[PDB]
Design a protein around this nucleic acid. Sequence first.
DNA 1: GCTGCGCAGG
DNA 2: CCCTGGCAGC
Lengths: 254, 255
Amino acid sequence: VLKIISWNVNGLRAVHRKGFLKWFMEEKPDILCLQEIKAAPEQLPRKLRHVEGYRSFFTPAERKGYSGVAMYTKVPPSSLREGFGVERFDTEGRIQIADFDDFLLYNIYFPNGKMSEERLKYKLEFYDAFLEDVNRERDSGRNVIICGNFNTAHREIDLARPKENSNVSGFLPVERAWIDKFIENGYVDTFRMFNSDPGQYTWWSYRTRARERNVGWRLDYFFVNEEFKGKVKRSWILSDVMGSDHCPIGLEIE
Amino acid sequence: VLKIISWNVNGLRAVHRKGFLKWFMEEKPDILCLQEIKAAPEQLPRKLRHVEGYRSFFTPAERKGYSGVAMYTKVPPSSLREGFGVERFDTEGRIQIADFDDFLLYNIYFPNGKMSEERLKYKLEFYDAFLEDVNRERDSGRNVIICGNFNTAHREIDLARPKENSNVSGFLPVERAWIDKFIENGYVDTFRMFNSDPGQYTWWSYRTRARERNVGWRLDYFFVNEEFKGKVKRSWILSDVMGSDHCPIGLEIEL
DNA sequence: GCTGCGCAGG
DNA sequence: CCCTGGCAGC
Ligand code: NA
Ligand code: NA
């Protein structure tokens, strides 16, 4: 019976100033995966690097204040890999792959593609690189949990405004069609195992008070290889948890 | 009678959002000099590039959002130089030397030297290059007006806290001594021609609401060469004018 | 629009 | 600068 929370935090210091540690202590997950920490361990106060009861692992971007992932874990993994083995995907603080023996845990910050054609191309080629890696590990016989900010709403049910956003990154046909492809490779959007309601989102704009209106997008996911789905009991969204433009999401297994 | 205003604005777009053009048109100086505009002119609203009754000149830094000087003048100058002919000093949007025939106007944004040892070195060497340039012009017969953010308080009277800043850039012995040196070469701090009082500042920290308590430094100056000092009728601080960490300073000359 | 963080201001 | 005026997020 494990608890895992994934949160795209948008600044680990910012959330800290907002009461991250209290929230984390109230929630007591077995593993806490974070994305977009925008920080390297050296910029973090000692009480954030070292949380009583947890080993911490930070994978910052080469670029200061940019991107970065983190994992807190009551039980250390056996190993921790920080790349797909492709330099351009591996230096942006996007990838954590932790071996917990009963599964591999992918903690991924997938690229925003709305900036340019350059980055949308990078996002998609990142997607490609990820799929190879996850398939290679699954095909070798590992059960895999993937969580993080995928930066793509899968279906029209997954965002408040499906029609106006058909030409926007976050809901382009190429991106949606990569998630179809991913799922069709034997993986399961664990949230939609339990909940097929619309209005269920994980990200909202800061502008136009988008969160209060609930005009949002489901961008953050927990996926599992399908052979492992029986072991998942709960996959939910912690939508009342504030402090970032994303809310956290939760998974419970075995 | 000409009125020149000098203002280190810390963002021209920002001071624009706070009423700059209305203030500008009320003050109506013959020349307005601005430093630290933090803008290339392409980035500026149109009403900042085209001000009725003024030629405008923009000398941006290579670095985006950084430094930069501007000048608005009712009567255009015959030429405008944008450097001393030393490339590391000339790319940072710091220098405008405008030939107004009756005088040269130096609109200079002098470097902040408190970040690093490297930047303090740059500041003092920028000071050396400046003095050499103004001296050459002065020696050749030109009358010179120099306005801008010198980033140094000259004497104890030039800041609220002389004693605690004895070791801080803004008030280092090296920096104060350069101003001493500059003055010794034939140049006059014009505000001190008319006002010997303390508590006269042009810059204050945003932190601790220091402007509301007048806990400030006089970083912004109008200088002239000795030979031109009798032409200056007014040198004052526009300390009520809000919008930046600096306030504007003014000069009146009679030609 | 809005935000977090970088750099820089002095 | 505890305060303020590019890049990126989506
Ligand atoms: Na900002
Ligand atoms: Na800032």
